[PDB]
From Swiss-Prot:
The gene is BETVIA. Changing E60S: Slightly reduced interaction with BV16. This is Major pollen allergen Bet v 1-A. PANTHER family: OS08G0374000 PROTEIN-RELATED (PTHR31213), STRESS-INDUCED PROTEIN SAM22 (PTHR31213:SF55). One of its GO terms (biological process) is defense response. It comes from the Eukaryota. Its main location: cytoplasm. Keywords: Allergen, Cytoplasm, Pathogenesis-related protein, Plant defense.
Amino acid sequence: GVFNYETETTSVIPAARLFKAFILDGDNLFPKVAPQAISSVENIEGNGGPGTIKKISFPEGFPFKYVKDRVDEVDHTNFKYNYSVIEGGPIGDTLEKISNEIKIVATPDGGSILKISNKYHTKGDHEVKAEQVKASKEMGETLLRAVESYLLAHSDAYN
């Protein structure tokens, strides 16, 4: 079945720039700005749209070795990005997939709001634990704050 988790967070970076950097260039940025969170991102297949497969490796000592993520949808107009965790890490005989939807919305102060949904698809029926949702939220927040710091410091990046 499906367990749905939703959260929101804010950024001081305008929505379009944040989307271009944090979403569209995460493969480059995450290992650069947050090497103690993500060791590397490998493009396995695909050119960035629906179906593109990436292997995300975690640093030594992390709970999981890697995950493979699949791009589901990329909406450049509405700053929506959907992707799924489809192999590795928590995926296996109790958890088939984690489907994620991110939307970035502008705020009038010049920042943005990020709306995040994480949908865990289980076999039957293997309760999803608060600790696992917390870890995903914490990773996302770490990556966001690292990218935000980089964007604040490199004004000519991603305009």
